């Protein structure tokens, strides 16, 4: 009697598959906050559920009511492999939510070094100030996250060279 969102959240994949039997638009049904089964699975790091949902027709681009995305929820949790699966479907990497974040800013804020590296490698923007007045490097510096700062630096040096 758990909802599809809870089944996704808890990695109850056999039950989720049975529930999605019909292969209809259930896979993208938003809950009361606009969260899809994919956004719940991403938030809780349930990679095999994410993989199945994408294969079954889940739309990774859907934003919840306050502009939360599967990508941002994966980034705040440090789920680098989920981030990668989502980036493969060409989701917007610079999604600005109403909480004042972006995927990169959540990866920085969580000191998720490999997540930061993944997002940068796919071309996440560094040049833009968040609503709070912080660029991603500004935030890494303020938080004292030196490993994140280094990954940002490595990337920035590559950007002013075209050859």
């Amino acid at each position: 009697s758990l909802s599809i969102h809870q089944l996704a959240a808890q990695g109850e994949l056999d039950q989720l598959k049975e529930h999605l039997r019909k292969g209809d638009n259930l896979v993208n049904k938003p809950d009361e906050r606009g969260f899809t089964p994919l956004i719940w699975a991403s938030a809780f790091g349930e990679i095999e559920t994410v993989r199945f949902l994408l294969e079954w027709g889940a739309d990774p681009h859907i934003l919840a009511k306050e502009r939360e995305s599967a990508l941002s929820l994966a980034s705040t949790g440090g789920y680098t492999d989920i981030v990668g699966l989502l980036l493969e479907r060409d989701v917007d990497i610079n999604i600005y939510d109403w909480n004042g974040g972006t995927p990169l800013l959540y990866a920085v804020h969580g000191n998720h070094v490999k997540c930061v590296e993944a997002l940068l490698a796919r071309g996440a923007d560094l040049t833009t100030e968040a609503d709070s007045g912080y660029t991603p490097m500004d935030l890494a510096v303020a938080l004292g996250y030196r490993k994140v700062q280094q990954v940002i630096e490595n990337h920035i040096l590559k950007l002013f060279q075209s050859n």
Binding site: A9, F35, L73, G100
Partner: peptide, 16 residues
Amino acid sequence: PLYTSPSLPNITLGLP
């Protein structure tokens, strides 16, 4: 067993 909603943190909490 009900898991809490997906949440995004306040990224400038405690900062200037």
